[PDB]
Ligand binder design. Structure first.
Ligand SMILES: CNc1cnc2ccccc2n1
Ligand SMILES: CNc1cnc2ccccc2n1
Lengths: 264, 262
């Protein structure tokens, strides 16, 4: 894995592992999400991060995921998959990180993703707009012209996700994160919330359909000692669902999103 | 990853990933277990893991016991090479051993061993190996005994007792998700390792490191099943573990772990 010739993006190849695939012998959506996350960690490291600047570490600010959008066309089965990631400023809202998944053999694009990141205070959990001086510190590592993965006029990543009404059609109650789900800072990995959202999708839908799109807004972080409830409702060959992750007790909303499924 | 010069073992190098480490910035025991499993999968593939006679008879290889000793956990970014190989254990079953080495210093940072038995995949019944299916796997095994844990009266061959109630520690309501299931829709054996350790307190994890883990697989956990994880200190620190179904209290696993100071 290394930065491209200009140094404004990063590339990395991955061989799909045995424990990374599902019932259809192809890489699960959580494995793909982990590979996108891994390539983004190494891009921050290659340009000198450990991804907070010296100014961000002084004021106690961190980058947090606010929205994640992942569209897959072909899930890699032993296959080699190369991912090209890059970041771009989104004015004073925050940052945007895009990915392009390509099959290393056929060279075709087998998927792509985009995420919106915001600047949150490490301790008070309070959000704030990216100040001018902090913004230009990472501008030197971003393409100046707009390079989006999803350039489409009314693209399916900038649409507002509604709140699921009760009763939910499907549900999966009592979901708790384990030590494997926690990261190096002891927080529940963002990829775990993707797997929790999909736990409410029926087994019949998973066995007769494949996941094409997944848009997910991160509202609140799930602490290790918290228990979640996953809810789903069909809103529609293609099938659409409305998802909502919320705490078991107080019913505190932690996530909301939508998924699109295509026939096999 | 490729077979060694003789073809009686397989080697593979791995770069530790960001999402594969814990709070100490070193690879979790479940990630190490996954790497050992992955290298064993490719060793079976590299030699062409059920034969035509086993497929015709409707038989499969199932893990009966797993023993893993780690001395140095590879940190995020480190390269770790694992050398795996199989050996016949007479008519009982098969034994697969691993040697984890640091690719920079060349030293051994860990080693593992597992006992596998021959079970009929449909009726779930353990069957005797028989001479003919045994000689099919002998052409891919070292003839002389090559054990990762060769010590007589070692930590991998001692009988694990059943945990008595009340358990000192516990973690109830553990359910496997779609990520925990494998290609055949079964809960992969690394999830049971993570479930065993869920009952270990946070104080023990934050002030100690996992050195040894011996685990006997008694019953498989179906996707629609809920487990209860129990732990009791028997002592370095030693614990006695027991995984059992929430409802009927059906035992699915039993094992022991040894923890060293940091
Ligand atoms: C107040 N806005 C947000 C946005 N995204 C989040 C993701 C995780 C945790 C808290 C979050 N808060
Ligand atoms: C009765 N012997 C055994 C040995 N190992 C097993 C592992 C998984 C499921 C059932 C098993 N049964």
């Amino acid at each position: 894995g290394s930065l491209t010739e200009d140094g404004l993006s990063y590339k990395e190849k991955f061989v799909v592992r045995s424990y990374e695939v599902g019932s259809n012998k192809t890489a699960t959506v959580e494995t793909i999400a982990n590979l996108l996350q891994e390539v983004g960690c190494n891009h921050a490291q290659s340009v000198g991060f450990s991804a907070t600047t010296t100014t961000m570490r002084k004021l106690h600010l961190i980058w947090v995921t606010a929205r994640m959008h992942i569209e897959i066309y072909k899930y890699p089965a032993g296959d080699v998959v190369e991912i090209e990631t890059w970041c771009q400023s989104e004015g004073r809202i925050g940052t945007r990180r895009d990915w392009i998944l390509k099959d290393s053999v056929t060279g075709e694009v087998t998927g792509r993703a985009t995420s919106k990141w915001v600047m949150m205070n490490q301790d008070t959990r309070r959000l704030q707009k990216v100040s001018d001086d902090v913004r230009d510190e990472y501008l030197v590592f971003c393409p100046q012209e707009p390079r989006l993965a999803f350039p489409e006029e009314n693209n399916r990543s900038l649409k507002k996700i509604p709140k699921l009404e009760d009763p939910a059609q499907y549900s999966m109650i009592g979901l708790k994160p384990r030590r494997a789900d926690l990261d190096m800072n002891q927080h529940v990995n963002n990829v775990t919330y993707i797997g929790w959202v999909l736990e409410s999708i029926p087994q019949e839908i998973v066995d007769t359909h494949e996941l094409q799109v997944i848009t997910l807004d991160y509202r609140r972080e799930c602490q290790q000692d918290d228990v979640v409830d996953s809810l789903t409702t069909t809103t529609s060959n293609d099938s659409q669902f409305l998802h909502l992750l919320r705490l078991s007790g107080d019913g505190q909303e932690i996530n909301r999103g939508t998924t699109l499924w295509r026939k096999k």
